[PDB]
């Protein structure tokens, strides 16, 4: 039963292939032994004295009184709760940016996360750690040691000692029942319901020539989309985005999903990754066949940031120089946010110019839209989203009971809160400590 | 604490309305010509956008904050906090790691709304727009807190909505004061407050009640941690509203202990100042 | 196993954890190949190679080099903690040695992942753009014959 | 690896300078010469002996 090694893990030893190896190879041993002179031990044990009439419970109450004077003991408890919430919120945020690492629920799994390297999970864990060091401004470094090995994808703590007979005592220390991790799972689950409030958008992107003169609403498209991947006579571009140029008098053809060269003028489903490595072949060949009303592409970004450019419908506007800028800033690095052009809704019935528009989304992304004119009698020309009463049921709804909402679907701007009025005492303000 | 109205989405207006008075007068009706601030924004397109603690009078601040610019601007500077800095130019957002940027953007949103809703003074309304409802006066947030009480001159598209406002949905609904004369415990007013920010702050109060003990308990923890040498007793009288966030459980201390051994090293230069510290505390209190 | 415990378990660990050598393909089949002893149009690699996955938590720790690293380090700690070792190495150093050796085992490194998954699609391209094509004999592991 | 590694982008950006170097079409031209220079040298010393 000689305790040979007392060991502390930083990494869960079962997700790496290490379930059968010994404890001295999975966990990290402590290695400290400060030397003691026995001659100082023998003297100090064999000739210690005290006061004569020493009542020792009096002597300790005299001595231990200025160590329980305030919150000396109760700072480690406040530090321990933050090191539990920031540990789960680092374990959740690392294992949600990977394909199923931990049982952790994944509500925004639909957003694309390509990079799952340990270098990428080290930047996620470090910025979660920098958020808890900024919000709570705790100066001592919390969880700035689970990234000592390199990966926080397998961040799970465990401590174990090992006697000489192999009788290893090994008990884990799992994090307790969190509370911010429960709250961060409701911000995420609501985020998918309305990401348009944070300027993100669902659905894809359509580039068809639409020479409209009346109302145009790119974020909220009426009726169905022109086509969807896998429809009739709809082709998906191959992963290179290459174009085989045909000779004297024929037309150049895209290379579709597969190896077959299909001709450009028709319909196309451009995935977002192909457009990041073929923009110089997009803007030279297929994009003139978009402008001339021949082909229609579907730049199927999964989710994207958008950017609205409002304009006056009295004056003409071609949306092609705003799209040609957007196709120019596309690298293999990343795309700029999608530029939609929505007309400013006019109060009076006007004579609108014939304008050429291209980019309009597929799924309805016009959620973060408040009434078009909130200080006019009626919106004549443009879209007239009045102040929608669904976000305000605490104000206009008659059969609204105080205490309810609809949290994983919408946001309710007018609710009934509790406003606490606590008083925070010191330890001297509760008991008498003298 | 956060004495202002706890919300995080502000009713911004990107495109202002036409201030046209030479031609077609009477169409638009700004509230500026009545010396009145509007409760809902004027302008041709009034979008909701997330600016965390846009109306939060009371505290220096949580620290971090997420303020999305409205969709007229760029709004790719809140989605480049991770995996994307020296890799991608300034006008772009990274779509291959969009989930990781957005998840950390929601962590700025959650942590910055981890305050405590404090209750201000509740002056009863002497005027005639509400006629005696205990609303909460403040700087000039009387217009933005209560869209119910609002002077409505002409029927706009704001007035087409605010005319359906019910008049008893404003102000304090239920006050629970335990002791007469002293301050109340928790009033229950109604104001501009999204349910998403309300859920986070009602989680944080549930967190702070999860590490708070009664005074007959914290007098038993102070005595037993002093090995019952010096004992103290709490006076037995009704303290109305105390909150002492002071006590992690036995589980949360075990994680903080093993995290402290992970951060510190393994050699004898890091386990030594942990020994000489307690050796210094031993020599001062000893009688021997 | 009792007259020679650390030496039996070292002759067994080499026979169990030395990587099974493998082979892949290089070059184009229209071009023709110049190797003699291996197949006309193919290379031979001394680690088991697999195609490129998405770099999750699984494929960067299951590799043969990550298995050769994690089962040699786990052996030499069993060497450094033996009873024949304490003639010179005292107890304090033994913990330190173990602490240092393991610290070599838990360190994240992409090069066990790189040799399996990334390098054969990197060696096969580089063996067609160089002038002299790779002359190669077949790798044989732990075969007396 | 690097902190943002796309394995298809990294190899395509690094192999395209290699296939500009026409060593694959030099090493075929040096082979057909050393075929014709072998048989005209093998027979030139096997006609003497």
């Amino acid at each position: 039963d000689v305790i040979t090694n007392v060991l502390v893990a930083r990494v869960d030893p079962a997700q790496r292939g290490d379930a059968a190896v010994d404890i001295r190879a999975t966990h990290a041993t402590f290695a400290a032994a400060l030397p003691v002179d026995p001659a100082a031990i023998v003297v100090a044990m064999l000739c210690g004295q005290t006061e004569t009439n020493l009542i020792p419970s009096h002597h300790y109450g005299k001595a231990f009184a200025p160590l329980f004077a305030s919150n000396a003991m109760f700072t480690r408890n406040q530090r321990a709760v933050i090191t539990r919430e920031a540990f789960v919120c680092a374990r959740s945020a690392v294992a949600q940016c990977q394909d199923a690492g931990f049982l952790v629920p994944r509500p925004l799994d639909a957003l694309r996360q390509f990079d799952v390297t340990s270098a990428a999970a080290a930047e996620i864990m470090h910025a979660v750690n920098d958020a808890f060091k900024t919000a709570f401004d705790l100066d001592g470094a919390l969880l700035d040691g689970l990234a000592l090995y390199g990966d926080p994808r397998i961040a799970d703590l465990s401590a174990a000692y090992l006697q000489y007979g192999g009788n290893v005592v090994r008990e884990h220390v799992p994090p307790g029942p969190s509370h911010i991790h429960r709250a961060l799972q409701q911000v995420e689950s609501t985020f998918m319901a309305e990401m348009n409030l944070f300027n993100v958008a669902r659905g894809n992107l359509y580039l068809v020539q639409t020479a409209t003169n009346g109302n145009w609403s790119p974020m909220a498209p009426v009726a169905a989309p022109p086509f969807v991947r896998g429809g009739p006579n709809v082709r998906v571009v191959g992963r290179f985005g290459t174009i085989v140029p045909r000779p004297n008098g024929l037309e150049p053809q895209l290379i579709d999903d597969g190896n077959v060269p299909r001709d450009i003028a028709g319909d196309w489903v451009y995935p977002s990754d192909v457009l990041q490595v073929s923009v110089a072949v997009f803007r030279d060949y297929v994009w003139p066949m978009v402008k001339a009303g021949r082909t229609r592409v579907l730049v199927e970004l999964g989710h994207y940031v958008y950017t609205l450019h409002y304009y006056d419908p009295q004056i003409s506007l071609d949306e092609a120089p705003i799209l040609e800028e957007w196709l120019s800033k596309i690298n293999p690095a990343g795309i700029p946010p999608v530029p939609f052009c929505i007309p400013i809704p006019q109060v009076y019935p006007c004579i609108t110019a014939r304008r050429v528009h291209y980019a309009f989304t597929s799924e309805n992304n016009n959620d973060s839209l408040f009434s078009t004119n909130a200080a006019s009698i009626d919106t004549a020309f443009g879209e007239n989203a009045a102040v929608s009463p669904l976000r305000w049921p605490g104000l206009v709804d008659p059969n609204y009971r105080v205490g309810t909402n609809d949290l994983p679907n919408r946001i309710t701007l007018y609710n009934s809160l509790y406003r606490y009025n606590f008083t925070y005492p010191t330890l001297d303000g509760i008991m008498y400590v003298r | 604490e956060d004495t202002g109205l706890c919300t995080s989405f502000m009713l911004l207006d990107n495109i202002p309305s036409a201030h046209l008075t030479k031609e077609l007068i009477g169409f638009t009706w700004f509230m500026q010509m009545y010396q009145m601030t509007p409760p809902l924004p004027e302008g041709a397109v009034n979008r909701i956008v997330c600016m965390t603690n846009w109306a939060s009078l009371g505290d220096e601040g949580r620290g971090l904050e997420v303020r999305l610019p409205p969709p007229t601007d760029s709004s790719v500077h809140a989605y480049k906090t991770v995996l994307s800095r020296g890799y991608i130019d300034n006008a772009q957002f990274n779509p291959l790691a969009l989930r990781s940027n957005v998840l950390l953007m929601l962590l700025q949103f959650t942590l910055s709304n981890l305050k405590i809703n404090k209750s201000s003074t509740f002056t009863s309304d002497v005027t005639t727009i509400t006629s005696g409802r205990m609303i909460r006066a403040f700087p000039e947030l009387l217009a933005l807190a209560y869209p119910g009480r609002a002077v409505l001159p002409t029927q706009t598209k704001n007035a087409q909505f605010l005319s359906t406002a019910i008049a008893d949905r404003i102000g304090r609904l239920d006050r629970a004061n335990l002791i007469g004369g002293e301050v109340s415990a928790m009033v229950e007013c109604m104001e501009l407050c999204d349910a998403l920010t309300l859920h986070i702050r009602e989680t944080y109060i549930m967190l702070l009640r999860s590490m708070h003990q009664d005074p007959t308990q914290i007098v038993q923890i102070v005595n037993e941690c002093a090995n019952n040498l010096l004992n103290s007793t709490i006076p037995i009288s009704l303290r109305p509203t105390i909150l002492c966030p002071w006590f992690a459980s036995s589980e949360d201390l075990r994680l903080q202990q093993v995290m402290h051994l992970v951060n510190i090293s393994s050699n004898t230069a890091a386990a030594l100042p942990l020994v000489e510290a307690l050796s210094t505390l031993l020599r001062s209190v000893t009688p021997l | 196993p009792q007259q020679a415990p650390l030496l039996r378990a070292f002759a067994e660990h080499i026979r169990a954890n030395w990587p099974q050598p493998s082979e892949f393909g290089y070059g184009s089949t229209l071009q023709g190949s110049a190797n003699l002893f291996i197949p006309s149009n193919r290379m031979v690699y001394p680690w088991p190679n697999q195609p490129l996955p998405r770099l999750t938590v699984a494929p960067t720790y299951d590799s043969a080099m990550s298995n050769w690293i994690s089962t040699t380090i786990a052996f030499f700690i069993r060497v450094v903690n033996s009873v024949n070792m304490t003639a010179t190495v005292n107890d304090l150093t033994r913990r330190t040695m173990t602490g240092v050796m393991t610290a070599m085992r838990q360190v994240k490194t992409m090069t066990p992942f790189y040799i399996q998954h990334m390098c054969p699609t990197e060696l096969s391209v580089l063996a067609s753009v160089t002038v002299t094509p790779p002359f190669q004999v077949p790798f044989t592991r732990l075969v007396q014959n | 690896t690097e902190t943002n590694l796309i394995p298809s982008h990294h190899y395509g950006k690094a192999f395209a300078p290699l296939f500009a170097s026409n060593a694959m079409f030099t090493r075929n031209q040096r082979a057909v010469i050393t075929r014709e220079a072998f048989v005209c040298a093998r027979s030139a010393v096997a006609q003497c002996q």
């Binding site: 290695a31 000592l148 090995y149 390199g150 | 090293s265 393994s266 050699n267 230069a269 | 690699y45 001394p46 330190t96 602490g99 240092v100 610290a103 070599m104 838990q106 360190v107 994240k108 490194t109 090069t111 040799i115 390098c119 060696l123 | 690896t1 690097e2």
Partner: peptide, 27 residues
């Protein structure tokens, strides 16, 4: 990229590579 900034700090807790790239090229 062969960077020893993690292996050094792991073993300092308990206190150019051409021979490797020669070894891959000789396979």
């Amino acid at each position: 990229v062969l960077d020893p900034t993690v292996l050094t700090n792991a073993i300092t807790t308990i206190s150019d590579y051409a021979a490797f790239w020669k070894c891959i090229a000789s396979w």
